[PDB]
Amino acid sequence: LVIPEKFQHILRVLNTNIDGRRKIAFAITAIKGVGRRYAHVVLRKADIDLTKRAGELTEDEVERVITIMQNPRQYKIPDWFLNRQKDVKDGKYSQVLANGLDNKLREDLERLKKIRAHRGLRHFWGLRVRGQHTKTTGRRGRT
Amino acid sequence: FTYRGVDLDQLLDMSYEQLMQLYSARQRRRLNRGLRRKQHSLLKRLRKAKKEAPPMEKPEVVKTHLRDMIILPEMVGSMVGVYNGKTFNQVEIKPEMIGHYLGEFSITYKPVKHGRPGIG
């Protein structure tokens, strides 16, 4: 390759230290709320070649990535790559990232505790939720 | 309170056809399948028991077996006993549970709280 001279050895995108030397299509996965498929379908509309790394970029590319990344409907990331489809409050097809991700997980758990449902007491107790066969499991992390 | 961008007065004034896009996959699935006559009659007993109550007072609790009832938002504010095999658990239907079943509110078994092994 070449030696790109603007190489930030640390990236800071949305309250996350990103190892900027990693591949761009696999360093966006490092934050919560974005996986592998999702950052790829971002970059196919974020108009950055996959050949580059994550520290080889311009901030104009960074600001258009974060622009598409917070405006997922307006840049043709349609409503199945989204982290949350229909919220409890607004039902708005919208991506939810790391701080808001833990916030909305906490929101749903606090809701189901307040609901007094079969799920909410499991989530307060920290047990299995999807009806598992624990006749041989439940080993690591139980005391 | 708001559900899916729709309010409580907005939901309770909304028709039965337009509910069927505002729910989950199983719930829109079952409302496509169409409710049974038993659940119709249970909602009718809920109408009679929610109407005849004094205006300060919460309605008289109606007990029921049918754990597989979709909590319609029209039921919000009532008190329903849900049968989990042994005991009618009496739940006040708050508006936070309009997208769930009754059957999750009367938790059916008792949680395992271990002892100690004897002869294993």
Binding site: R116 | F88, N89, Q90, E92, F105, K110, P111
Partner: peptide, 14 residues
């Protein structure tokens, strides 16, 4: 903070 409605059963689930 047990509800005035429900039994001791769900309250043991609380």
């Amino acid at each position: 903070k047990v509800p005035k409605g429900t039994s001791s059963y769900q309250a043991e689930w609380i």
